[PDB]
Amino acid sequence: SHHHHHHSSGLVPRGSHMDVVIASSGGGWQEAQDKALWAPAAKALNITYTQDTFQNWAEARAQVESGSVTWDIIQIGIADEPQAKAAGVLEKLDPDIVNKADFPPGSVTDSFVANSNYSTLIAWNKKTYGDNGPKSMADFFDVKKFPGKRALWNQPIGMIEAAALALGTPRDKVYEFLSTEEGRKAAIAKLTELAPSVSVWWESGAQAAQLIKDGEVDMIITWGGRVQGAINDGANFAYTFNDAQLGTDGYAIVKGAPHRDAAMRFLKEMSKAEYQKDLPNSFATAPANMKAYDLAKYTPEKMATMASAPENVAVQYSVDPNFWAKHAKWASEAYDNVRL
Structure with a gap:
């Protein structure tokens, strides 16, 4: 080229070149996903990850357009999925990643897996x-x-x-x-x-x-x-x-993700019923995997409040x-x- 691609930060990078980079909105929502999904799924798979934060999917578009893809998994809203898919920002996920039958209609696409519903x-x-x-x-x-x-x-x-x-x-x-x-x-x-x-x-x-x-x-x-x-x-x-x-919130893998194959393993694991069921314990949300409900064992009064509950999905x-x-x-x- 004709300009510097990198600059000398006299810092020794903390993580590993095997650490999957996962990003969300930060705060309590990111702490909730981490405690319920990310840390347990990683311990299970015996893999490592690092956290990042972001406020818009357009930040991932900037990485893809520039050829500087540092994120693997991005937590976006289904609303942003058509725009990001059309812009070539999302990688097409493996066929068997999830079973659409475990999730409400339209909450899973070829480039998007849901984690929650509202x-x-x-x-x-x-x-x-x-x-x-x-x-x-x-x-x-x-x-x-x-x-x-x-x-x-x-x-x-x-x-x-x-x-x-x-x-x-x-x-x-x-x-x-x-x-x-x-x-x-x-x-x-x-x-x-x-x-x-x-x-x-x-x-x-x-x-x-x-x-x-x-x-x-x-x-x-x-x-x-x-x-x-x-x-x-x-x-x-x-x-x-x-x-x-x-409504749906979920995850997508960024096109040209440095740890694409490992991020895929990680996304398949955190989508499982066993991790999903713990998501409402720390945050006011509904798991997208309805098999989580076999594991939660909630009261009829509790069930009637859940956005993704079978009794409520049927009337939406x-x-x-x-x-x-x-x-x-x-x-x-x-x-x-x-x-x-």
Whole structure:
């Protein structure tokens, strides 16, 4: 070349050239994955690993584009999977890595294995409705049957789909309905028709949870763990997984990973039921491997709270990250107009 590829850090590298590099968001989530999945799976395989942190998948794209791939396994969201797969950032995983049958629909791809699941669900104020709150997207969108203050996300994901389900669309045909210009317009028109009754467009889960606590909303579509966290904090709220959107977090191996073969062994191992079952012990999440439930032995009351539980998976629809990859531009500006 015509420039330095490396610079003299008078430091002796701490790890080994056999250490698989695994990265996530840092903090408690990374400590939780490490204690539950990474450290036990590594001890089992008799391999070694090092931890790194990152805030966006685009950082891995930069490594691939530059030819400086230092990470092996990256912890991303299913939302980022179509974009990263199309950009040549992710390595295609081995066929037998996992059995899709052990995981909810759309949570496993040729370049992505899920580690956890969450839900965007309907919650309501018991002070307003008691036990008789909205128990579907149709009920949530009915200002005649259920009058009151609605709170929606300021982002369109899960919201346009809620409008489509409200229009009578079956859970399994949500993205078939939204595949046409006619269906997309109908869904936005439904949001507009409800817009006057929407008192708040919440920005973050921390804000959403504080609103549930303070009794400022009559009903809301937010993340389950925020609603459940606030019921535990003392909020007089109730909720349902009926018509909720099942979301996914997981792992991918970076294209040109220095320890590609070892990272593959490590990913196959940490996805096992025996490691997955310990993930909710330290963090408010649901394991993606449902075989983990044979191992957890939770109470019926505990089970009803889990996003990935068979009883709750059956009443949900999985997010289509490919739909959102294709229509993210239209959706944003169409939804922005509804809020304003």
